[PDB]
Structure formats: structure tokens, C-alpha cells
Amino acid sequence: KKGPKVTVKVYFDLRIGDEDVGRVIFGLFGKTVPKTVDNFVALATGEKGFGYKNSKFHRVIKDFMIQGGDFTRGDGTGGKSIYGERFPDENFKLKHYGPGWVSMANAGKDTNGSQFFITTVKTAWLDGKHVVFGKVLEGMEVVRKVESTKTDSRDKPLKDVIIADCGKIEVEKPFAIAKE
Numbered sequence: 001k002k003g004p005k006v007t008v009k010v011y012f013d014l015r016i017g018d019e020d021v022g023r024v025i026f027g028l029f030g031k032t033v034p035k036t037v038d039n040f041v042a043l044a045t046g047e048k049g050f051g052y053k054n055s056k057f058h059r060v061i062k063d064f065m066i067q068g069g070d071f072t073r074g075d076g077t078g079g080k081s082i083y084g085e086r087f088p089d090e091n092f093k094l095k096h097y098g099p100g101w102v103s104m105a106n107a108g109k110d111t112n113g114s115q116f117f118i119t120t121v122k123t124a125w126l127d128g129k130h131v132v133f134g135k136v137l138e139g140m141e142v143v144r145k146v147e148s149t150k151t152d153s154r155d156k157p158l159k160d161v162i163i164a165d166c167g168k169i170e171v172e173k174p175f176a177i178a179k180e
Helices: 034-045 140-147
Strands: 005-016 019-028 059-061 065-068 101-104 116-119 132-138 161-176
Touching (some): 005 140, 065 140, 065 161
Antiparallel strands (some): 005 161, 019 132, 059 065
16 A cells, blocks of 8 residues: 555457457556556557557567567567657656566667566566556456467467457546555
């Protein structure tokens, strides 16, 4: 009850190939990292005319993370933010406290676009390099299902892991969560 406040939620409804695998719900920390949260949320709602719906997770590493958000190329080379192709690191106030914490994937300093990690273990080695902005609240078992999927040499799922639907769920009263 001492950690960051969840100010808004996002859902993803996921499929692996032609299998419906369920819903993941994230809580996002809009008081801590509003710019980074606003990007992720808008990409989830598709409200700028582009975003995560119909896109695929392109990298899965068991006992590390699953990575998605490249809705332009589906391979890690693409993606774009609501702020243009790339935007700077907002802050590093939050750490990767435990499994299910969500941060921006990047290509170095100030190269945030649309790609994100959903961590599946505590990933302290990402602290200070990747902007942490949310965490899984519900559907960690769906994350685990994706985490276990078979992959190619690029660690890309053999069967497309598709965000079949996504959007936001409003939070009337922001609530603090534990840093774990």
C-alpha cells in the first residue's frame, strides 16, 4: 500500500495461433510516469488511429519476459509512439520489483517507441535502463502461456501471439499497490 498508484487499466485479449488464450489486465502508474502511461494506454485503445490491436508479440524468453508492441513490423525493428517514432526516457523512479512488472523495451537511451516487456521473473538488471510504468494485475496465467510458447531462432513465437482486442478500463479512485 506504499508503492505507486494504479490510475488506469488496460486489457489485452490474446490468441496463440487459432487458440483463444484469455485476457491480461495491467495497472498503469499514471502519477509516476504519465507520458509513458499515456502512450501505452492510447496504443491499447487505438485512439490515435494506430496501435496494438492485431499486432503480435515478437520475442519470448522463458524465465525472463515476453515482448510485444511492434505493430508496424512485428519483429522488433518497428513500432511508433503517440509522440512520433521515438521519445525520451521519462524517469526511472520505478524498478522491476518482481514478476509481471511492465517496462519499455528500447534500443538504448531515449529510444522509447511502442515496444514493452512483460517480465515473468524479477528483472533488476533492467533497472535504470527501461522505464517501468505498469504491472500485470490479472491474467498472469495468460502471460505464462505465452511465455511457454515454442519459438524460432530469433526467440519469436512459431505461432502468432496476437493481441486480438485491447483497450482501457477506467479506475475511479487510484489505488496504491505493493512494490513486489
